[PDB]
């Protein structure tokens, strides 16, 4: 492939460099339209800018935490982090978010990796290997109430059991209701006067719930869960302007008030170098 062809002096009536940008086109002008060039080859394919590659590496999408401790006398397991959940979503952590929102609709399979590490803040003894249970709780399923409810039987709901310190990995097909996931949605769930506006209404994907299977030892053990997400089989439509201001909320476009100028002011003139 040639990156530049050889081109010499020109004295024409045919001027490729004068255009009318009002038309909305970006005319494909090249170095050889306005200087004299020599042949050179590309030596490159643009492999690593493919959208599959761009969205295809694992990104941290969520960090939560649960603890193993005596539940005796706990009136609210959920509240003691005896188990915890996560209202699945991919917009909470914002590094991966800016990348996805370069597109309007996106379609992909997900590969999740879950790393779980333990911490023993209060001076301790022997730690017996804890086994985490991650179970997917889709919309309209008995949400779990204690850390050892019938829910955890999970007879119809996919769940994975792995050890703290290890990693769990599995992959979920594209579960969207439509043909693509909306990265943006300028609509409502119905024409009410006070119903929420955005996507949050659209990406009702239910939540994920974690717990330790082990009963309690004499000390307490903090287990912190990190969920990583990798898109595989990516398809993206309609590019948009990149995010300039900071994010404030999952699912709304809102930016913070009295934010700071995002364009760097010159130290000098327009004329400055």
């Amino acid at each position: 492939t040639v990156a530049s062809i050889s081109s010499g002096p020109k004295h024409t009536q045919k001027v490729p460099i004068l255009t009318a940008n009002e038309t909305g086109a970006t005319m494909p002008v090249l170095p050889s339209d306005s200087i004299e060039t020599r042949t050179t080859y590309m030596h490159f394919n643009g492999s690593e800018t493919d959208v599959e590659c761009f969205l295809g590496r694992a990104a941290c999408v969520h960090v939560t935490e649960i603890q193993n401790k005596d539940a005796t006398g706990i009136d609210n397991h959920r509240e003691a982090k005896l188990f915890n959940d996560w209202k699945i979503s991919l917009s909470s952590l914002v590094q991966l978010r800016k990348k996805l929102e370069l597109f309007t609709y996106v379609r992909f399979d997900s590969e999740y990796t879950i790393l779980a590490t333990a911490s023993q803040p209060d001076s301790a003894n022997y730690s017996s290997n804890l086994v985490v249970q991650a179970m997917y709780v889709p919309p309209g399923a008995p949400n779990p109430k204690e850390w050892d409810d019938y829910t955890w039987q999970s007879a119809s709901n996919p769940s994975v059991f792995f050890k703290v310190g290890d990693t769990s990995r599995f992959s979920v097909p594209y579960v969207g209701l439509a043909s693509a996931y909306n990265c943006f949605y300028d609509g409502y769930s119905h024409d009410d006067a006070e119903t929420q506006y955005g996507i949050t209404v659209l990406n009702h994907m239910g939540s994920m719930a974690f717990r330790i299977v082990n009963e309690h030892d004499e000390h307490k053990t903090l287990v912190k869960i990190r969920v990583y997400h990798r898109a595989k089989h990516v398809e993206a439509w309609i590019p948009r302007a990149p995010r300039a201001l900071p994010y404030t909320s999952i699912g709304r476009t809102n930016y913070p008030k009295n934010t700071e100028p995002v364009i760097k002011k010159r130290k000098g003139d327009i004329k400055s170098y």
Binding site: P138, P139, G140, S156, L177, G206
Partner: protein, 59 residues
């Protein structure tokens, strides 16, 4: 107020004109539908799509 054979019966009144016999929304996973076999199976899945057949037999 307690489950009875009677909640399967939609009553009809002689001589009423213009009026309404019954009403329900179509949340097949809840409400009237929920205990029916259809309702009961739909509940093992997260998403549904398709046509429903609703019939009335007169007695």
């Amino acid at each position: 107020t307690k489950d009875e054979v009677n909640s399967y019966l939609i009553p009809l009144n002689a001589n009423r004109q213009n009026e309404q016999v019954f009403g329900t929304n179509l949340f097949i996973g809840d409400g009237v539908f929920k205990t029916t076999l259809l309702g009961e199976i739909v509940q093992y899945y997260t998403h549904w799509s398709g046509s429903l057949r609703f019939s009335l037999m007169y007695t």
